[PDB]
Design a protein around this ligand. Sequence first.
Ligand SMILES: C[n+]1cn([C@@H]2O[C@H](COP(=O)(O)OP(=O)(O)O)[C@@H](O)[C@H]2O)c2nc(N)[nH]c(=O)c21
Length: 175
Amino acid sequence: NAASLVHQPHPLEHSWTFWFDNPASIRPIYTFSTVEEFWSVYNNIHHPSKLAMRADLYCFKHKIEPKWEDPVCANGGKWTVNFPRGKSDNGWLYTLLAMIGEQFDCGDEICGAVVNVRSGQDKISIWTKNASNEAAQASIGKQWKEFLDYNESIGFIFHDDAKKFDRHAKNKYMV
Ligand SMILES: C[n+]1cn([C@@H]2O[C@H](COP(=O)(O)OP(=O)(O)O)[C@@H](O)[C@H]2O)c2nc(N)[nH]c(=O)c21
């Protein structure tokens, strides 16, 4: 019948899974495939301003696990921005909307995004694949900056560098 005709969900290009890691133990929590489902889920998850300290919240394409060791992420890396503790909610949102909406030019390279809640600063990173494709990675980083109205340099860290050099990994590109 008509019920599902006049209130038809609007499907996204990809399915996305939110994962959480709480203050190899990163649980998935909600998978969505439609706009409706996104908002439903985003409106029942805490925004970064009300997350607990040291929490990580991930939003990755379905079947990409948010781990350096995932074979889609393995040769990839991450653009990172910083915001003050408690002032990262809009950035997170604008980031989610940019990804699920397929707004990035080089959106093929996009794996997902993560907000890291820390005392002092919040960080949001976008994870991509093909770290060695500078042209692509620079496109994404610039464009993210433009989406966010961010006015500072951002950097990109190969997952291979992160794995090897924990604290000490340097940015390979900057935009
Ligand atoms: C994001 N991530 C972090 N780790 C490891 O877990 C640690 C968690 O560090 P953090 O909690 O990201 O920041 P903070 O400790 O400065 O507050 C990192 O230093 C990495 O050693 C990770 N280990 C794996 N295998 N995969 C991941 O995606 C990953």
